[PDB]
Scaffold this active site. Structure first.
Site, PDB file in Angstrom:
ATOM      1  N   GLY H  30      46.070  45.078  34.899  1.00 54.48           N
ATOM      2  CA  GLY H  30      45.264  45.402  36.071  1.00 54.48           C
ATOM      3  C   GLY H  30      44.791  44.209  36.880  1.00 54.48           C
ATOM      4  CB  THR H  31      42.888  44.292  40.100  1.00 52.44           C
ATOM      5  OG1 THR H  31      43.850  44.484  41.144  1.00 52.44           O
ATOM      6  CG2 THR H  31      41.703  43.536  40.650  1.00 52.44           C
ATOM      7  CB  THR H  32      41.697  39.067  38.200  1.00 53.80           C
ATOM      8  OG1 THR H  32      40.733  38.262  37.511  1.00 53.80           O
ATOM      9  CG2 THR H  32      41.844  38.557  39.627  1.00 53.80           C
ATOM     10  CB  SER H  75      40.219  44.473  35.089  1.00 53.87           C
ATOM     11  OG  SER H  75      39.509  43.585  35.935  1.00 53.87           O
TER      12      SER H  75
END
Lengths: 241, 233, 242, 250, 244, 198, 111, 244, 243
Positions: H30-32, H75
């Site tokens: 996932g995104t940070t 995240s």
């Protein structure tokens, strides 16, 4: 608590549990029913894997749901009791609310409904039972004979058989029952029944039991002798040729 | 590999995937294409209706949730009926209890949270339908994309279904143009039709084949089918 | 094992697809909708000559203005017909009016996906999908004569003509060429009777096949064997005519 | 959440065996040896306090437990399973008997109750059978003294003397030689201590041995006086000292 | 999920058999043999104790012969624990009938109910069946002396003489050989002991390995009496019959 | 209340029950049969609350008839009454009790003797040579205490009832529109259609 | 002891012409001897050309009207925007009222 | 054998729970997102991958508020994160209703902790596919927490999770060393904006949108608020300057 | 067949693998902890390891305060540790309310062990991969150390150790008690009992500790408490002026 879906569709569109429930019927003792002009007759074979039973108390194969309707079966003996009970209860409930005994069609439709339900309910297996339900509608003289199977499907027959070697006895009835002239007598109706069983039972005076249902709650089961007489008269029809 | 970790939604794959959810998403791609796009005054849904036979009807793809909100479907129709009905209730609840039209953004949150619950518990299955929600609330026009994974995204325009990438590239290009189609519904619908036709291949959009819905400033969410869309073909 | 509401890698429900396979093994049912009424015809298909053919009930009445035909595991249909009948009568009690054919069909389909071992959405207590497809035919003042195909998938389509069962793909192709928007009721009757004859393993007569129709005037009626026999006779004459 | 294990975890195998019960008995066999001997005027139950570390205090762990003032229990197998069974046994002695008839249950009946509990863990959904065998010794007015064995299957049998666990086979054999229908309680204790000595590898004394008796009433252990009908508990656990005194006459 | 570990105890084999019922019967085929014989003037119950020791207290023991009613008793074959669960409910059903009708429960009615309970575990619930087979010996004023048998499948039947547990085949043949309709209780007691003595997997048939019960209507009374034989009484009848 | 009378003679039980059904100010029916056949040899008469009366009777009838088919046997008059008593004794402590009083007259084919049971809505059962419910008993019991013999023929019993009815017609405020009389013996249940002037 | 009901007075009148209908009502709302409002509407447009007024206990009146308006909304949702006929509304309202048969909406209603 | 990784609550031979670790993989994918604890508050920041020009800028908010003083960011599987925040909100409301005082950050942490931990106790539920960074100001100071799918959580000076967690963590470690006295709220916002931009390099293929929120005793009265307008642009520029 | 290792059912050998694997989880933290009894106190020492520089060291703890009197130290993963802690606190609070006095250390131990036992028997509940050491100065028994495991087993100790290098610490402590001939640390002040614990912690492990490498809890009459970094530092200084 338990609700695991036991009866489910397979890749080829089959419900194996219902399919195998029929295999349990193919295992059960042969049951047969023929309808005359003014009567219906139910015949069943008695096993002989173990012989030393007390015939007085041992559960008979043809059961009364009400005074005017009877039910015979093929397959698991235990399962049939559960169905027979539910039918008897519903027979009384119908009398209590409609103020009129069940029609053979209705009683059948109910027994089929119970079986069907067990084919798509969680945590249960289908009934290993096929039934023959016979009798006369209240104040009616037209004979009635129905059959049900584990699938929940039901329908009326002029004559039908279920159980082991039901294939054989059906063939007999197909080429021995004329819809134009159905057995016009109680006697010749029972005769055709025993004949059809003798195709499978293989010399069984004590291995064949018959029940005759007439209009207006007139149900009677034949004794060993009465049947044995039919057997004696039938074996002569062969030898006189 | 995949075979061992795709039996139910309750299982993670070693790579961190939920295959049951991914399989549900695949049902969308098999579904008929539908397009959404919005200006600052209106939001439009253009959906391609699919037929089984030439003897069957073209299955409806747009559902009205409230006087100010609606959605288009792609995938399993019954699952669309379930989620739309749930959304109908949330719009209905907001009105009765608070005398308040439900914000499109919040409607998306509610659809996200409901879809999520079907991805964490044993026995259940993910919803097999994509949803494009349009609506005109207290903060202008809106367009939402709903995925069975629970992912809801607000967009100016988008498309889901088979060949949907054609319409999506088109809108990504037409962006600066359609975003300014304010006070003119007919131009926004035509822009949606030119979007959807970018995903054709089999046939051409006919009268009993096209489905268009619109919401906006002084336009209650209304669905146009058949004869009513003839002037757009 | 594997869940009863599992998704296939191709985005389909296993149990629903396998359910459709069971329907392919069922007796043929045909529906044709005209501006004079909708006609329903089924293959009785008795398993033995001893089986009293008229006890086969594959076309049933939901209401006076709505009737339906079944195909596949006909036992599964009982609870569906029951629900439909109840839904119709209930709606009449609530609004003093006939239920719309579409609304009725939508209600029947609402049961279809109520299966599982505990699916998080409500209380779907049913171990498997229905093993039967329904052809629901009726009439209402809003959309006239209607024919619907209700699958165990929960989805229902509206057909001008439709065939379900063993000989469906064949019968459907036949319907494709034969149907037009200006057919008369009689024409549809013979048409169903013809297509049934083609797909049936048995030689079609008034005992292994049954017709029925729904007309605004007289509602849903099941054709008695005598009336059908004459239509079969009428068909044979018009086929041998060229 | 929710226990979705509503199905049995013990089922019949094609051979007719009940796997989980057999395996439970296998776990019992691995347990420390315990025994019971019935005398003419008492019963004795004994086991070895197998300390799992010399830092652990062997007193704070009773392998012999009082169920009623006239009934005691000892085991072989899984400690934790025994502990919870004792709790359930003590409670069921009240809920199913004392709170109804105003008196403690007779040995056979309390045994029957414990048997039932273990039986249900053999059939109920989502559970395994208890991994212990119990030796319950008690006294009641109309049956006198009795000794019972309760297995993971839920089955139970009365004994004159027996042993369970590790070296049960050898211990039972030694008891068959030494037992008679004329044994006094002290003699049974002596025999018990002898039989247990063969089962103990290391130290054999009042700190490594746990032994209790069902004998005469102990009015000094009652806690109150003034009710002639109440004469005290028949169950008594022997002290570390009392054991050593009898070990010198070994 | 949990589905992984589900044995599915209530499913049909491709042949149409119930796995758990079959395997449960195989379980019973190893349990101590129990025999019931019905005579003209009473019924006899005899059972072989499986596994014994010199230290097994036989006086306070009962593992096969249980008293349901004052007029009905059972012979047990299989799991003793499972049996006791069914025995308890049976005893309750009997009393429930008595409270309701003020008449002792007819033998079949009690037997049917117990058999129905067994049938239940056969069709739903996902639980294992009871590894028990019962021989019912009882009397009522409608059928007189009655002998029944029930198994894990929930099926029951009546008999003139029957055996359950180990070596039923050999036992049944020997009974079918020496049984006669006009038999007396004392003849039955003997037949029973002989049958066991020839089907036993042990060296000799001693008293300590047996349980015995008779349901007679002692002429000097007019009522039905149940007699569960004491160790000394089994020892006596064993010498008289010529087994010593 | 309504009139519910019962009398056990040598070989039969005779049940007499009023034919009137009155609601408030008006007599709605003058030919009511306040009895139900539970089995071929057991009859039950009833009186009490408007709805409960028949509803309870038919319920009991349904259960006995179900038992009869299940066992293919007829429950003894004693057994039947005991079942009815428990049903009433359950009812009394339920949310809304059945306010019904019953007389159970049956012939015991096993003992070859007639039997009469009297149960009230509380579940108070008693076996009696003769019984009544409500106000009827206040006039009848002394009559029957006087003229009753256990060896009386069925004919003598009917005469005895006639004397009871006459007394109830003279001294009792309510016109109960005569009675329906039924006899329970070894041959079953038959109705005396001629009691309007016997 | 708490009384769930009250009375807010007012009157409503409905007259049906040959091709029209009127439903009128005063705009006064009262409690005991005090006036709550001189203008509080009592007759409502529910859609599908239906006007309704539930007069009596204001709270029950509003709640019933509210439930019916909402019933109309759902009639469209469930029946492809079909128009609710006046007779169909009447029957629907009967069920709405009879639903609280043992805790009645304390209102006379006219449509 | 194997198959220890097919059911949630199962222990593998080495005492591990693979399904939990498999959930971690979904987080890492996932995104940070990050959290920076300053001298009187906390600052939250997250990467917002712009899939296309069709995404409405500033609309698809990812940072969530619990109560009025707690900020949460995560995240991995966004829906799972939302589900967790829904629970936290109910949890916080339950606390305030009984105790009047708004839920302390450590109290709130254990509440989310126990709930997530619960989803590792049964095979009928799937573990959470999110790591959540949350915190705020309470009775005695500011707190920063990070919660793993395992249910494990600790207090942090700086926390980071997702795609570029290493880039973030490294930058955070530099800040902890170079500011032993404590970073200010204003500074932490700018600093977070940088760390996000720097951590975005592990995803430099797609364009992104920045999102910051903060809870400072002096700057926001101890209430959770979003960084908007001028203060956002200032932070965006501070990063865009130091990326080159 | 091969699922007898996934759920708490018996293996053919009569074992429960899930219980055995739950035990294996207790070492996942690589932390050692010991407990010793004083004359009128009980002291627990546990290794404090803080790898990440971004962690707030004040929040990293495996010692818990269950009640005013009872303290608990956990060997195993923190999510399971905290699960067990909360339950123990709830149980302690409920007991006091229901029975009118403070729940004794051994009773809480028994209760927690019984709970663990249930997961050993029920298929839907997994064991908690934690070992729980409870400490107090019980108003009836005095200084108390009771320890529970994933098997549901529990017992009282004169002194105990848990973790990877448990055996080394155990044998070291054993030898001291073989030597001293007593079942406790004969000291009046708890400060010296804490010092004793840290001393034999170092001797057995062969490692030196800074103020941030340890975690200490002390149980006394009517109170249990944890030491701060500085309280530990004061203890580390005292042991240094002896070696």
């Amino acid at each position: 608590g338990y609700d695991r879906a036991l009866s489910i569709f397979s890749p080829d569109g089959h419900i194996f549990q219902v399919e195998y429930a029929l295999e349990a019927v193919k295992r059960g003792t042969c049951a047969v029913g023929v309808k005359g002009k003014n009567c219906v007759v139910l015949g069943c074979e008695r096993r002989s894997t173990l012989k030393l039973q007390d015939t007085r108390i041992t559960p008979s194969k043809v059961s009364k749901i009400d005074s005017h309707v009877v039910l015979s079966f093929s397959g698991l003996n235990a399962d049939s009791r559960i169905l027979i009970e539910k039918a008897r209860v519903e027979a009384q409930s119908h009398r209590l609310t409609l103020e009129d005994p069940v029609t053979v069609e209705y009683l059948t439709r109910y027994v089929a409904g119970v079986q069907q339900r067990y084919t798509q309910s969680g945590g249960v297996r289908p009934f290993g039972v096929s039934t023959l339900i016979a009798g006369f509608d209240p104040r009616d003289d037209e004979p009635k004979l129905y059959q049900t199977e584990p699938s929940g499907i039901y329908s009326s027959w002029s004559a039908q058989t279920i159980g082991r070697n039901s294939k054989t006895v059906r063939e007999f009835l197909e080429k021995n029952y004329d819809r134009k002239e159905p057995p016009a007598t109680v006697e010749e109706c029972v005769k055709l029944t025993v004949r059809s069983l003798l195709e499978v039972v293989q010399t069984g005076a004590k291995n064949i039991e018959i029940t005759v249902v007439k209009p207006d709650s007139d149900i009677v089961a034949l004794s060993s002798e009465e049947i044995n007489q039919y057997v004696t008269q039938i074996e002569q029809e062969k030898q006189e040729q | 590999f995949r075979n061992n970790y795709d039996g139910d939604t309750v299982t993670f794959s070693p790579t961190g995937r939920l295959f049951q959810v991914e399989y549900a998403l695949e049902a969308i791609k098999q579904g008929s294409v539908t397009v959404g796009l919005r200006s600052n005054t209106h939001a439009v849904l253009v959906a391609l209706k699919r037929n089984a036979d030439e003897l069957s009807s073209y299955q409806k793809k747009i559902i009205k949730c409230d006087e100010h909100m609606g959605l288009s479907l792609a995938g399993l129709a019954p699952d669309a009926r379930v989620l739309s009905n749930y959304l109908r209730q949330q719009c209905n609840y907001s009105s009765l209890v608070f005398n308040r039209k439900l914000a499109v953004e919040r409607a998306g949150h509610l659809l996200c949270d409901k879809a999520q619950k079907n991805t964490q518990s044993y026995g259940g299955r993910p919803y097999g339908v994509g949803l494009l929600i349009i609506g005109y609330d207290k903060s202008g026009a809106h367009l939402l994309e709903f995925q069975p994974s629970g992912n809801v995204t607000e967009l100016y325009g988008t498309a889901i279904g088979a060949r949907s990438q054609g319409a999506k590239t088109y809108l990504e290009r037409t962006l600066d143009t359609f975003i300014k189609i304010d006070g003119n519904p007919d131009e926004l619908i035509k822009a949606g039709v030119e979007a959807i036709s970018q995903s054709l291949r089999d046939e051409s959009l006919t009268v009993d084949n096209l489905s268009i819905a619109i919401v906006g400033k002084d336009t209650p969410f209304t669905i146009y089918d058949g004869e009513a869309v003839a002037k757009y073909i | 094992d594997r869940g009863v509401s599992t998704f296939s890698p191709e985005g389909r429900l296993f149990q629903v697809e396998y359910s459709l396979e069971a329907i392919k093994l069922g007796s043929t049912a045909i529906g044709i909708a005209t501006k004079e009424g909708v006609v329903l015809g089924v293959e009785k298909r008795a398993t033995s000559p001893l089986l009293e053919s008229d006890s086969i009930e594959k076309i049933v009445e939901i209401d006076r203005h709505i009737g339906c035909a079944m195909s596949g595991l006909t036992a599964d249909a009982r609870s569906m017909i029951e629900h439909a009948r109840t839904a119709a009568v209930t709606h009449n009690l609530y609004y003093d009016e006939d239920i719309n054919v579409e609304s009725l069909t939508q209600s029947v389909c609402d049961l279809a996906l109520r299966f599982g071992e505990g699916a998080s959405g409500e209380e779907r207590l049913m171990s498997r999908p229905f093993g039967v497809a329904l052809l629901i035919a009726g009439h209402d003042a809003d959309d006239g004569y209607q024919l619907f195909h209700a699958e165990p998938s929960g989805t229902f389509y509206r057909y001008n003509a439709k065939a379900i069962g063993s000989g469906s793909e064949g019968a459907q192709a036949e319907l494709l060429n034969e149907w037009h928007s200006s057919l008369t009721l009689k024409e549809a009757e013979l048409l169903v009777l013809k297509i049934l004859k083609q797909v049936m393993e048995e030689k079609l007569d008034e005992n292994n096949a049954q017709l029925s129709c729904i007309t605004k005037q007289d509602g849903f009626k099941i054709y008695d064997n005598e009336k059908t026999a004459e239509l079969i006779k009428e068909l044979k004459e018009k086929e041998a005519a060229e | 959440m929710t226990d979705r294990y509503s199905f049995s975890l013990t089922t019949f195998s094609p051979s007719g065996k009940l796997g989980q019960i057999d395996y439970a008995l296998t776990a019992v066999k691995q347990g420390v040896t315990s025994l019971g001997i019935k005398a003419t005027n008492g019963v004795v139950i004994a086991t070895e306090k197998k300390s799992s570390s010399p830092l652990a205090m062997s007193e704070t762990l009773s392998k012999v437990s009082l169920l009623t003032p006239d009934i005691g229990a000892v085991y072989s197998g899984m400690g934790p399973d025994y502990r919870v069974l004792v709790d359930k046994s003590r409670k069921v002695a009240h809920t199913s008997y004392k709170r109804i008839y105003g008196e403690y249950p007779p040995t056979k009946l309390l045994v029957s109750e414990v048997a039932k509990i273990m039986q249900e863990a053999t059939q109920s959904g989502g559970v395994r059978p208890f991994g212990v065998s119990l030796l319950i010794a008690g006294h009641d007015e109309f049956n006198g003294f009795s000794l019972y064995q309760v297995d993971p299957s839920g089955s139970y049998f009365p004994w004159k003397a027996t042993a369970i666990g590790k070296g049960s086979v050898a211990a039972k054999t030694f008891l068959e030689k030494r037992w008679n229908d004329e044994l006094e309680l002290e003699d049974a204790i002596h025999i018990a201590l002898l039989t247990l000595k063969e089962s103990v590898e290391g130290e054999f004394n009042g700190d490594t041995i746990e032994l209790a008796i069902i004998g005469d009433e102990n009015p000094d252990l009652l806690g109150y006086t003034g009710i002639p009908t109440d004469k005290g508990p028949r169950f008594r656990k022997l002290t570390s000292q009392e054991i050593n005194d009898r070990l010198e006459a070994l | 999920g949990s589905r992984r570990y589900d044995s599915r105890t209530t499913i049909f084999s491709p042949e149409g058999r119930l796995y758990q019922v079959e395997y449960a019967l195989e379980s019973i085929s190893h349990a101590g043999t129990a025999i019931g014989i019905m005579a003209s003037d009473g019924i006899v119950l005899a059972a072989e104790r499986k596994v014994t020791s010199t230290l097994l207290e036989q006086d306070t023991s009962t593992e096969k012969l249980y008293k349901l009613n004052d007029k009905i008793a059972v012979a047990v074959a299989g799991l003793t624990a499972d049996a006791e669960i069914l025995i308890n409910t049976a005893r309750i059903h009997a009393q429930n009938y008595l409270k309701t009708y003020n008449e002792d429960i007819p033998v079949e009615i009690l037997v049917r109910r117990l058999s129905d309970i067994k049938q239940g575990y056969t069709q739903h619930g996902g639980l294992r069946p009871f590894g028990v087979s019962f021989i019912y010996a009882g009397y009522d004023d409608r059928y007189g002396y009655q002998l029944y048998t029930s198994n894990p499948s929930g099926n029951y039947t009546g008999w003139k003489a029957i055996s359950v547990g180990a070596n039923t085949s050999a036992a049944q043949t020997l009974l079918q050989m020496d049984y006669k309709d006009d038999m007396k209780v004392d003849d039955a007691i003997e037949l029973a002991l002989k049958t066991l003595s020839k089907t036993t997997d042990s060296s000799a048939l001693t008293y300590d390995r047996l349980e015995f019960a008779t349901i007679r209507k002692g002429a000097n009374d007019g009522e039905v009496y149940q007699k569960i034989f004491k160790p000394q009484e089994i020892k006596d009848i064993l010498v008289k019959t010529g087994i010593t | 209340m309504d009139i519910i009378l019962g009398i056990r003679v040598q070989d039969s039980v005779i049940l007499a029950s009023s034919k009137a059904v009155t609601r408030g100010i008006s007599v709605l029916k003058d030919s009511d049969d306040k009895t139900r056949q539970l089995s071929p040899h057991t009859l039950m008469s009833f009186a009490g609350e408007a709805g409960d009366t028949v509803q309870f009777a038919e319920y009991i009838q349904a259960n006995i008839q179900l038992y009869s088919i299940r066992e293919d046997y007829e429950l003894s008059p004693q057994a039947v009454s005991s079942f009815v008593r428990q049903e009433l004794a359950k009812s009394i402590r339920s949310r809304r009790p059945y306010q019904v009083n019953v007389l159970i007259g049956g012939y015991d084919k096993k003992k070859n003797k007639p039997e009469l049971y009297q149960i009230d809505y509380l579940g108070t059962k008693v076996e009696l040579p003769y019984g009544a419910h409500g106000y009827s008993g206040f006039y009848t019991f002394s009559l029957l205490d006087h003229h009753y013999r256990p060896d009386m023929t069925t004919e003598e019993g009917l005469d005895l009832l006639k004397l009871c009815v006459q007394e109830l017609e003279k001294r009792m405020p309510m016109d109960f529109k005569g009675v329906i009389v039924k006899i329970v013996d070894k041959d079953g249940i038959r109705q005396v259609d001629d009691f309007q002037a016997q | 002891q708490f009384n769930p009901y009250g009375d807010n007075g007012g009157t409503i009148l409905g007259i049906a012409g040959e091709d029209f209908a009127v439903l009128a009502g005063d705009t006064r709302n009262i409690t005991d001897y005090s006036i709550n409002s001189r203008y509080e509407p009592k007759v409502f447009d529910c859609g599908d050309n239906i006007v309704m007024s539930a007069n009596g206990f204001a709270a029950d009146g509003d709640a019933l009207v509210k439930r019916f308006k909402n019933s109309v909304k759902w009639y469209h949702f469930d029946h492809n925007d079909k128009k609710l006929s006046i007779n169909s509304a009447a029957r629907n309202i009967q069920h709405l009222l009879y639903g609280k048969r043992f805790f009645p909406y304390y209102v006379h209603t006219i449509i | 054998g194997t198959g220890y990784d097919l059911s949630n609550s199962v222990f593998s031979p080495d005492g591990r729970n693979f399904q939990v670790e498999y959930a971690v993989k979904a987080v890492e994918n996932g995104t940070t997102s990050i959290g920076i604890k300053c001298n009187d508050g906390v600052v939250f920041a997250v990467e917002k991958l712009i899939t296309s020009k069709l995404l409405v800028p500033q609309k698809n908010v990812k940072i969530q508020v619990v109560d009025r003083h707690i900020g949460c960011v995560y995240s991995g599987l966004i829906p799972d994160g939302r589900h967790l925040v829904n629970r936290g909100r109910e949890e916080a409301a339950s606390f305030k209703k009984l105790y009047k005082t708004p839920i302390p950050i450590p109290a709130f942490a254990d509440r989310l902790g126990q709930y997530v931990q619960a989803h590792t106790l049964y095979n009928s539920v799937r573990p959470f596919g999110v790591s959540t960074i949350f915190g705020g100001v309470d009775k005695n100071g500011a707190h920063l927490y990070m919660l793993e799918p395992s249910g494990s959580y600790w207090g942090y000076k700086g926390a980071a999770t997702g795609k570029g967690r290493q880039s973030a963590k490294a930058e955070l470690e530099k800040l902890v060393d170079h500011h032993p006295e404590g970073l200010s709220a204003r500074e932490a916002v700018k600093q977070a904006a940088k760390i996000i931009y720097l951590a975005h390099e592990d995803n430099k293929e797609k364009d992104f949108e920045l999102e910051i929120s903060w809870c400072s005793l002096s700057e926001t009265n101890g209430l959770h608020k979003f960084v908007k307008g001028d203060l956002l642009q200032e932070a965006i520029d501070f990063a865009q300057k130091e990326i080159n | 067949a091969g699922y007898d290792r996934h759920i708490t059912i018996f293996s053919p050998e009569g074992r429960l693998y899930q219980v055995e694997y739950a035990f294996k989880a207790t070492n996942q933290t690589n932390i050692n902890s010991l407990a010793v009894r004083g004359k009128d106190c009980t002291v627990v020492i546990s290794q404090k390891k803080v790898p990440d520089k971004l962690l707030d060291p004040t929040t990293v703890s495996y010692i818990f305060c269950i009640s005013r009197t009872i303290g608990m130290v956990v060997n195993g993963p923190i999510p399971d540790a905290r699960n067990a802690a909360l339950r123990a606190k709830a149980e302690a609070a409920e007991f006091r309310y229901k029975y009118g006095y403070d729940m004794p250390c051994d009773v809480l131990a028994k209760r927690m062990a019984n709970l663990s036992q249930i997961y050993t028997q029920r298929a839907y509940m997994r064991p908690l991969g934690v070992i729980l050491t409870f400490v107090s100065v019980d108003e009836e028994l005095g200084p108390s150390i009771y320890k529970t495991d994933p098997a549901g087993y529990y017992v009282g100790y004169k002194a105990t150790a848990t973790g990877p290098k448990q055996q080394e610490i155990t044998t070291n402590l054993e030898n001291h008690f073989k030597k001293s001939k007593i079942d406790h640390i004969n000291e009046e002040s708890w400060e010296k009992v804490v010092e004793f614990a840290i001393t034999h912690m170092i001797d057995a492990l062969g490692t030196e500790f800074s103020k941030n490498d340890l975690e200490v809890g002390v149980a006394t009459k009517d109170k249990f408490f944890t030491l701060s970094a500085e309280n530990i530092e004061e203890r580390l200084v005292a042991i240094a002026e002896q070696d």
